[model samples]
Target: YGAGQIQVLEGLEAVRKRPGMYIGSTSERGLHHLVWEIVDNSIDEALAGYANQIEVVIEKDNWIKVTDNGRGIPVDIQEKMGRPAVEVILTSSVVNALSQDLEVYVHRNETIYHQAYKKGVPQFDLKEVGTTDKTGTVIRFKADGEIFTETTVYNYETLQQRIRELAFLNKGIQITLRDERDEENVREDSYHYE
Candidate 1:
């Protein structure tokens, strides 16, 4: 609907310097936010009337892929980096990928304290993973072993119930949660149907 020359925010120097402030700490909520941040970008695209479908999958080896029918992140050359803007963003540390459980847990703790210290409340966190074709964004964050201290698998039913409630509250929005953790037990559910 509107067009303007591309604008790039200063690289994530601030996130690295203050991950807590940006993410909210090294806790479970914050760890989850990492995933939400990426999803939110997609949600924004859908809200802008550019997309109709969104899908998220938690793959083996901790690969999380969030996709949508919106325009993909811009692949055009970036004026500042002189390379595909996608490459500049993905290759940059600003797009964090947890290759191990330790970092996952560590960031969880870091975010928890940050939230309690600032908002006086603990919150689930999300971070922007990457955008595609200037229309969709995908984020991937692995839960740290430390944060899981006890578990890495999530409570599917509980999560489904909560997500369903949100969808109901926001009428006309379609929200679906698919749990593929168990190939034999592939479960799917959705809410906010017209």
Candidate 2:
């Protein structure tokens, strides 16, 4: 691709400033785009046959929780950044930049690794937690109110239809969309296309 066709953006701040360049605009639609980006990361694993089940939850306080039973993101240190690969992956992503806070839990190598971030900045280095037999990744984040001034609240049906659409298009993959915001009547939808 030519230079005119390519835009080399460095730093999470670069993503924060010109979000429109990465995402369409800072509108309600753009807010949802962040969710899709995180979901797409899991979908990539599914496409590669590492993951089959993907779950999304609208947690209390409008936090979006996405989990996938895929080969978990690498936690080993990288030569260039000297940081865990998982840290590098999340920090360099637009989802981390646009979100006010984000958390990652990776279940791999029989151990669960945890890390927290604020506006793409690492709160602490990755640390080991409990053990898990499964391999996957869990990401939970809240959109920044300042960045998403239009609206930070996520629509239930907005994610509902999109999740179903993806599952229908990708056969053999499982997807679940749950709304836990209303504890009185938590709702969930599951899909598995033949």
Candidate 3:
């Protein structure tokens, strides 16, 4: 042979090829890992005394939303990427890596920044959505059905237990979990100290 060939994977290609290497497996656990990754960021804020309340919602059609009343992800251009800090974070995470669709709404700087992603790529540039004094981040994503098996539906009880434990461990933080998939039987719970 005159020469040997080598291939290189860049960006999210490596993550897509070996997802289990990053999130464990392409099962229900991996699917939930995506949510946990985002939630952990909120918990970090609470741990730092910057946040007091966190909301996690499982909406209809397998969409998951996590919101927190914490300092939002920075919107200023990142020195390395020349993109907003929020965009850089989302693009580098499993939120977009393994989602059929992802939407991030960040409220900061008296304005809301909305960005959409599909398969780890931005659908469009970030848009400023009106003015607001509210400050926080709301991430809504739909798991990629193609990557996760059909049997991998989110387990509400499991998530509730984990989040409840986090609340108890964190002491002043309040965490709420809600299931809005059923119009006839909506369920909600909040975990907090007395």
Highest lDDT: give the candidate number: 2
lDDT of 2 by residue, 1-194 (tens): 33311332247769998888888999999999999999999999999989999999999999999999999999999776667899888888898989999999999999999999999888999999899999999999999998999899899889999999999998888999999998999999999999
C-alpha lDDT values of all predictions: 0.47, 0.91, 0.85
Candidate whose TM-score is highest: 2
Candidate 3 local lDDT, residue 43: 97
Error of 3 at 193 (Å): 1.9
Q: Once superposed on the true structure, which residue ranges of model 1 sit more than 4 Å away at CA? A: 1-18, 91-152, 157-162, 165-173
Write down the worst ten-residue block by lDDT for model 3.
Answer: 1-10
35 Cα displacement, candidate 2 (Å): 0.8
Give TM per candidate. 0.59, 0.94, 0.92
Q: What's the CA error at residue 13 for candidate 2, in Å?
A: 1.2
